[PDB]
Design a protein around this motif. Structure first.
Motif, PDB file in Angstrom:
ATOM      1  N   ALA A 298      -4.163  -6.172   6.757  1.00  0.00           N
ATOM      2  CA  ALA A 298      -3.629  -4.870   7.152  1.00  0.00           C
ATOM      3  C   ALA A 298      -4.672  -3.939   7.809  1.00  0.00           C
ATOM      4  O   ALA A 298      -4.356  -2.777   8.068  1.00  0.00           O
TER       5      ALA A 298
ATOM      6  N   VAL B 294      -5.847   1.981   1.411  1.00  0.00           N
ATOM      7  CA  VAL B 294      -4.768   1.890   2.386  1.00  0.00           C
ATOM      8  C   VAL B 294      -4.268   3.351   2.433  1.00  0.00           C
ATOM      9  O   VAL B 294      -4.007   3.973   1.385  1.00  0.00           O
TER      10      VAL B 294
ATOM     11  N   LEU C 281       2.266  -6.486   8.689  1.00  0.00           N
ATOM     12  CA  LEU C 281       3.093  -6.713   7.518  1.00  0.00           C
ATOM     13  C   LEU C 281       4.552  -6.512   7.921  1.00  0.00           C
ATOM     14  O   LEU C 281       5.285  -5.741   7.293  1.00  0.00           O
TER      15      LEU C 281
ATOM     16  N   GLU D 159       3.811  -3.164  -3.263  1.00  0.00           N
ATOM     17  CA  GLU D 159       2.690  -4.056  -2.954  1.00  0.00           C
ATOM     18  C   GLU D 159       1.369  -3.611  -3.556  1.00  0.00           C
ATOM     19  O   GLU D 159       0.502  -4.454  -3.792  1.00  0.00           O
TER      20      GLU D 159
ATOM     21  N   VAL E 288      -9.009  -0.272  -6.323  1.00  0.00           N
ATOM     22  CA  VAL E 288      -8.089  -0.169  -5.189  1.00  0.00           C
ATOM     23  C   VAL E 288      -7.309   1.151  -5.178  1.00  0.00           C
ATOM     24  O   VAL E 288      -6.970   1.675  -6.238  1.00  0.00           O
ATOM     25  N   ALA E 289      -6.996   1.668  -3.977  1.00  0.00           N
ATOM     26  CA  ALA E 289      -6.280   2.931  -3.882  1.00  0.00           C
ATOM     27  C   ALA E 289      -5.217   3.021  -2.777  1.00  0.00           C
ATOM     28  O   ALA E 289      -5.477   2.666  -1.643  1.00  0.00           O
TER      29      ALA E 289
ATOM     30  N   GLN F 120      -5.317 -10.237   1.594  1.00  0.00           N
ATOM     31  CA  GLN F 120      -4.122  -9.485   1.968  1.00  0.00           C
ATOM     32  C   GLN F 120      -4.462  -8.084   2.471  1.00  0.00           C
ATOM     33  O   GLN F 120      -3.789  -7.562   3.353  1.00  0.00           O
ATOM     34  N   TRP F 121      -5.497  -7.471   1.895  1.00  0.00           N
ATOM     35  CA  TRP F 121      -5.949  -6.145   2.280  1.00  0.00           C
ATOM     36  C   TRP F 121      -6.672  -6.187   3.631  1.00  0.00           C
ATOM     37  O   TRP F 121      -6.592  -5.215   4.383  1.00  0.00           O
TER      38      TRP F 121
ATOM     39  N   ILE G 118      -1.403  -1.981   9.935  1.00  0.00           N
ATOM     40  CA  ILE G 118      -0.286  -2.258   9.017  1.00  0.00           C
ATOM     41  C   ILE G 118       0.929  -2.948   9.698  1.00  0.00           C
ATOM     42  O   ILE G 118       1.809  -3.484   9.006  1.00  0.00           O
TER      43      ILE G 118
ATOM     44  N   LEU H  40      -1.133  -5.778  -6.368  1.00  0.00           N
ATOM     45  CA  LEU H  40      -2.590  -5.922  -6.271  1.00  0.00           C
ATOM     46  C   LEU H  40      -3.335  -5.501  -7.542  1.00  0.00           C
ATOM     47  O   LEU H  40      -4.457  -5.960  -7.767  1.00  0.00           O
TER      48      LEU H  40
ATOM     49  N   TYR I  21      12.105   3.749   2.537  1.00  0.00           N
ATOM     50  CA  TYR I  21      11.908   2.295   2.541  1.00  0.00           C
ATOM     51  C   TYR I  21      10.433   1.913   2.584  1.00  0.00           C
ATOM     52  O   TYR I  21       9.996   1.052   1.822  1.00  0.00           O
TER      53      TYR I  21
ATOM     54  N   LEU J   7      -1.595   5.817   4.403  1.00  0.00           N
ATOM     55  CA  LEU J   7      -0.414   5.903   5.250  1.00  0.00           C
ATOM     56  C   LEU J   7       0.093   7.324   5.504  1.00  0.00           C
ATOM     57  O   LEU J   7       0.092   8.165   4.609  1.00  0.00           O
TER      58      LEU J   7
ATOM     59  N   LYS K  70     -11.066   0.107  -2.093  1.00  0.00           N
ATOM     60  CA  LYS K  70     -10.434  -0.483  -0.913  1.00  0.00           C
ATOM     61  C   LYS K  70      -9.218   0.389  -0.712  1.00  0.00           C
ATOM     62  O   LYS K  70      -8.329   0.370  -1.551  1.00  0.00           O
TER      63      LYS K  70
ATOM     64  N   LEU L 257       5.738   8.420   5.748  1.00  0.00           N
ATOM     65  CA  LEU L 257       6.536   7.251   5.433  1.00  0.00           C
ATOM     66  C   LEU L 257       7.934   7.671   5.009  1.00  0.00           C
ATOM     67  O   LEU L 257       8.125   8.685   4.338  1.00  0.00           O
TER      68      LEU L 257
ATOM     69  N   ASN M  53       8.076   0.064  -0.231  1.00  0.00           N
ATOM     70  CA  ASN M  53       7.357  -1.184   0.063  1.00  0.00           C
ATOM     71  C   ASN M  53       5.860  -1.107  -0.201  1.00  0.00           C
ATOM     72  O   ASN M  53       5.281  -2.077  -0.692  1.00  0.00           O
ATOM     73  N   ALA M  54       5.231   0.032   0.142  1.00  0.00           N
ATOM     74  CA  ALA M  54       3.806   0.236  -0.069  1.00  0.00           C
ATOM     75  C   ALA M  54       3.497   0.397  -1.552  1.00  0.00           C
ATOM     76  O   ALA M  54       2.487  -0.123  -2.020  1.00  0.00           O
TER      77      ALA M  54
HETATM   78  C1  LIG Z   1      -1.069  -5.975  -0.157  1.00  0.00           C
HETATM   79  O1  LIG Z   1      -0.881  -4.995   0.854  1.00  0.00           O
HETATM   80  C2  LIG Z   1      -2.023  -4.169   1.032  1.00  0.00           C
HETATM   81  C3  LIG Z   1      -2.257  -4.088   2.524  1.00  0.00           C
HETATM   82  C4  LIG Z   1      -1.833  -2.803   0.368  1.00  0.00           C
HETATM   83  C5  LIG Z   1      -0.636  -2.087   0.353  1.00  0.00           C
HETATM   84  N1  LIG Z   1       0.529  -2.584   0.979  1.00  0.00           N
HETATM   85  C6  LIG Z   1       1.364  -1.893   1.816  1.00  0.00           C
HETATM   86  O2  LIG Z   1       1.135  -0.763   2.228  1.00  0.00           O
HETATM   87  N2  LIG Z   1       2.489  -2.606   2.133  1.00  0.00           N
HETATM   88  C7  LIG Z   1       3.566  -2.198   2.954  1.00  0.00           C
HETATM   89  C8  LIG Z   1       4.558  -3.109   3.301  1.00  0.00           C
HETATM   90  N3  LIG Z   1       5.584  -2.841   4.119  1.00  0.00           N
HETATM   91  C9  LIG Z   1       5.619  -1.606   4.642  1.00  0.00           C
HETATM   92  N4  LIG Z   1       6.689  -1.342   5.564  1.00  0.00           N
HETATM   93  N5  LIG Z   1       6.524  -1.197   6.884  1.00  0.00           N
HETATM   94  C10 LIG Z   1       7.732  -0.845   7.306  1.00  0.00           C
HETATM   95  C11 LIG Z   1       8.599  -0.799   6.217  1.00  0.00           C
HETATM   96  N6  LIG Z   1       7.929  -1.119   5.116  1.00  0.00           N
HETATM   97  C12 LIG Z   1       4.665  -0.582   4.370  1.00  0.00           C
HETATM   98  C13 LIG Z   1       4.522   0.775   4.999  1.00  0.00           C
HETATM   99  F1  LIG Z   1       4.250   1.717   4.095  1.00  0.00           F
HETATM  100  F2  LIG Z   1       5.612   1.177   5.650  1.00  0.00           F
HETATM  101  F3  LIG Z   1       3.564   0.801   5.920  1.00  0.00           F
HETATM  102  C14 LIG Z   1       3.649  -0.916   3.485  1.00  0.00           C
HETATM  103  C15 LIG Z   1      -0.560  -0.878  -0.328  1.00  0.00           C
HETATM  104  N7  LIG Z   1      -1.613  -0.383  -0.986  1.00  0.00           N
HETATM  105  C16 LIG Z   1      -2.741  -1.091  -0.956  1.00  0.00           C
HETATM  106  S1  LIG Z   1      -4.199  -0.604  -1.774  1.00  0.00           S
HETATM  107  C17 LIG Z   1      -4.967  -2.039  -1.143  1.00  0.00           C
HETATM  108  C18 LIG Z   1      -6.398  -2.316  -1.457  1.00  0.00           C
HETATM  109  N8  LIG Z   1      -4.222  -2.804  -0.413  1.00  0.00           N
HETATM  110  C19 LIG Z   1      -2.943  -2.276  -0.306  1.00  0.00           C
END
Ligand SMILES: CO[C@@H](C)c1c(NC(=O)Nc2cnc(-n3nccn3)c(C(F)(F)F)c2)cnc2sc(C)nc12
Ligand SMILES: CO[C@@H](C)c1c(NC(=O)Nc2cnc(-n3nccn3)c(C(F)(F)F)c2)cnc2sc(C)nc12
Lengths: 361, 4, 367, 4
Positions: C238, C44, C365, C60, C7-8, C234-235, C362, C64, C52, C46, C42, C49, C56-57
């Motif tokens: 998003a 994600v 979430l 999470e 995962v990355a 969960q992945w 995203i 994982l 905050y 962004l 897998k 950012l 959060n990212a």
């Molecule tokens: C389990 O979540 C999965 C989806 C995931 C993530 N979660 C992730 O980016 N979560 C996240 C939660 N909340 C917020 N948030 N929105 C508004 C304020 N805070 C954000 C934000 F960065 F901004 F988009 C992120 C991270 N890295 C990985 S590598 C993988 C295989 N899957 C993931």
């Protein structure tokens, strides 16, 4: 293909700490590495048990030997510490507690190495990287220039302990135990150190307690095996390496009216040996009147075999260590207690051997 | 195992 | 060796408020995402950012990670190094700023280890100069000896990381090299070693930028290593895009709405006129009124090609790039406008319609 | 070159 202007290395093995726990393996690690670097056409100078003044002097003289294109390797075996990403080497005279002021900063050494335009900067620190609570100080070292030629091979990770083996007499420390098997390879030093890290991750005694850490910025495919660019007989290859040549001068085999031999264990550790070259029933050869600077004990002097003096590898052997502490010429008495007849006579001949090995400097 |  | 999973998490920051803006992390994150996906990772990915959202990212991503998992973090954007600690500066950082406004890479490493991971990689593509304003001294715990951490720094300590001066869709220096090496089936440490050698032949950044690699990795691990035999659920949540719809209008005009995933927080919408009545001599397919929390400038909306919106997408449609999907509070509702004219009538006619696509990519979430 |  890539070439070295010259290949110089410095090795420092501190064991006999005045106010800190004592180590026994830095002797063999430094002895074994010196031999391997010498095999790789390296000009080396190994020094055991050095104090702050001596360590700083040996580091200051290692910088004079360096110039543009030179390969500079520094190996360190003994107590050390890492405070805010800065590694320090602990000398044998450092007090308890101690701070940055008492220890040599590995990082500062590299800064001075950069000013001499080195082609390769290697630092193999075989020490613990655990933090110092007393050391509150935090100097801001003006950011190192981007030379893309620095390789750091730490025996352990940040906040971890580097270990040595207790079991044997010539027992190696974990780092040197693996490094000796890989050092002579013709790979880039980063690749060479990677193979060492894999072998280390195959020892069950080191699992979870000691992993190798490599910090690197080397951009060119440079190796310790790399050939020297010029002949060792030029009015540059002699001028630059003049001081190194002087710290390898073992005294000439003295003839006694008995034979005096001179062997080099380390650049600051000598080993002398008296030899028995019809009317005499028995005779004894003894060595005494040694300068009070070297601080030798008669129990450890005139031993039967070299192993009886605390050395690596029919005469009476004396380990003349800490030659750096010698203040002006090594002069000692060769006592001769002979028996013809119930009488027994004692003769004393004062033998001056000059300033040997590091003492010449 | 002796620490340095 | 094998990986339990691969995962990355990829972050690219450009839209800085009180700090200089960047252009290349868009291309850098985009390209590294594709290369990692080819390598069964897998990802994600962004963009821009705030503190905050980065916290959060990061949090999470750590959840994982697990025993045997290959975790990779990539950061392209503003950063600093003080007393051996690396900090990732988010787009909402004040000027001046301190460690409380940023994210500590060293702190993240501690958490990665707790989940007993098999391989940990940090490709930090940022500057490492001192932030003199931050006068705090950090007292942090000693990391555990795990012999599985690889640190790919784009520059050395006290030096900057570079990208080409605002000139189009070009990568930064680190990525210009890493992309032509990443898919190689060699140890991750040896692959980074090759990247240092390639970089050391670039003329633009000689004496100013060299790749720093810090590794503890004993096992012969690589990003190409296969996967053996809740995280996927969960992945997948998003990475859901709204399905293609049809907007039939009062005057008989049939519009087509397509959606594309550019980044995990960036989605492209594309409007095509699929039916045009024969008496409509002029008609325009506009897309107006987007949530204010997204921040969509109308000067950047409805372009002839994806390129003039900031996109990397593959007839006769208008593109709109909706960034900051993570800033959505409510559901994604917008107006599809119609400016039409008849064969006969003199003035143009206005026709609105509201479209609800929910919480795409995203935005699901809801934070 | 713009630094980052
Ligand atoms: C389990 O979540 C999965 C989806 C995931 C993530 N979660 C992730 O980016 N979560 C996240 C939660 N909340 C917020 N948030 N929105 C508004 C304020 N805070 C954000 C934000 F960065 F901004 F988009 C992120 C991270 N890295 C990985 S590598 C993988 C295989 N899957 C993931
Ligand atoms: C230039 O000297 C040459 C020999 C050299 C050195 N100098 C060196 O170790 N000099 C030294 C000088 N003085 C003292 N000293 N004794 C009392 C007070 N100060 C010491 C001491 F550490 F303690 F042993 C050392 C260092 N590294 C290298 S790698 C190479 C090819 N050659 C060298």
């Amino acid at each position: 293909q890539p070439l070295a202007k010259d290949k110089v290395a410095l090795l420092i093995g501190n064991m006999n700490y005045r106010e800190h726990p004592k180590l026994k393996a830095p002797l063999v690690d430094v002895y074994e590495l010196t031999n391997l670097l010498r095999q790789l056409d390296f000009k080396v100078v190994s020094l055991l048990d050095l104090t702050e003044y001596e360590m700083r002097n040996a580091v200051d003289e290692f910088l004079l030997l360096l110039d543009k294109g030179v390969y500079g390797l520094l190996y360190y075996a003994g107590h050390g510490y890492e405070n805010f990403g800065n590694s320090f080497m602990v000398p044998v005279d450092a007090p308890n507690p101690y701070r940055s002021e008492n220890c040599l900063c590995v990082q500062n050494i590299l800064k001075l190495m950069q000013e001499k335009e080195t082609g390769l900067n290697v630092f193999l620190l075989d020490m613990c990287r655990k933090r110092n609570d007393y050391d509150d100080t935090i100097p801001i070292l003006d950011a190192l220039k981007v030379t893309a030629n620095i390789v750091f091979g730490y025996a352990t990770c940040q906040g971890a302990e580097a270990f040595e083996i207790q079991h044997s007499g010539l027992a190696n420390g974990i780092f040197m135990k693996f490094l000796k098997d890989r050092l002579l390879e013709d790979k880039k030093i980063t690749v060479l150190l990677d193979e060492v890290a894999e072998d280390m991750g195959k020892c069950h005694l080191t699992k979870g307690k000691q992993a190798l850490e490599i910090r690197s910025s080397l951009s060119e495919k440079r190796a310790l095996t790399d050939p020297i660019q010029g002949t060792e007989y030029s009015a540059e290859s002699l001028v630059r390496n003049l001081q190194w040549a002087k710290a390898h001068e073992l005294p000439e085999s003295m003839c006694l009216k008995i034979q005096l031999g001179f062997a080099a264990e380390f650049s600051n550790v000598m080993i002398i040996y008296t030899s028995i070259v019809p009317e005499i029933i028995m005779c004894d050869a003894y060595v005494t009147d040694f300068p009070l600077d070297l601080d030798i004990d008669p129990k450890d002097a005139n031993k039967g075999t070299p192993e009886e003096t605390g050395s690596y590898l029919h005469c009476l052997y004396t380990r003349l260590s800490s030659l750096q502490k010698l203040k002006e010429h090594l002069v000692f008495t060769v006592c001769l207690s002979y028996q013809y007849l119930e009488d027994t006579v004692e003769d004393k001949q004062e033998v001056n051997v000059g300033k040997p090995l590091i003492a010449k400097l | 195992v002796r620490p340095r």
